[model samples]
Target: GGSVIVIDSKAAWDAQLAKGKEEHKPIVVAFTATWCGPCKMIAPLFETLSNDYAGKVIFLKVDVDAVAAVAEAAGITAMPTFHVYKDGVKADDLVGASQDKLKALVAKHAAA
Candidate 1:
């Protein structure tokens, strides 16, 4: 759990998205897995970004093994895939967890 919020249930996912809308914050949903080495590497960056953009963005993590349905619904084919949603609608995606890539992706969508 740590600084990155874990989203394990459908209700929680829906509630988190709802909360984002209510607070006018962007939603960042990350699909990851425990066995994924790259996922583990980028997790800290996600946590850092979550803390850095806390008030302005709602960051949530979905474990692919625990939430397969959510991962499928999100069209996630790879670990550590990221989707940025604005006002509940998906606006962009970053397939992997490179810090630079994520930084640019967040900056781009957060500004929009």
Candidate 2:
């Protein structure tokens, strides 16, 4: 239904991860948890942005509870946290439910 990729498994995430890195596309990873209310609240906006920026941005969402290893693997510490990766490296990180901040991040990287 949307462009946001729900990364439930490690292999699926890794494949897209490699593709984005190789293609030099901006990768946005939303680190969320089931119990995080903010994550639930911001989900729609995140998906909206993903569709709006479809080809320009690669949106990925990982549930910390379902994908526990990814939390530590990616060094994520907060629920509803976002990590922007470009040129195969982490460029920026944001945490919480600020739609404006998320939009700013997408504008900066997705537009570039």
For all predicted structures, in order, the TM-scores are: 0.90, 0.92
lDDT of 1: 0.81
Q: Write the per-residue lDDT of candidate 1 for residues 14-110, one digit (tens) a residue.
A: 8888887788878888888989999999888888887877666778899988987788788888778999877677878889768899988877767
What digit string (tens of lDDT, one per residue) describes model 2 on residues 31-80? 98889998999999999999899888899999888987778888877778
Model 2 TM-score is: 0.92
Q: What's model 2's lDDT at 18? A: 87
Model 1 poorest ten-residue lDDT run: 1-10
Error of 1 at 28 (Å): 1.1
lDDT of 2 at 96: 85
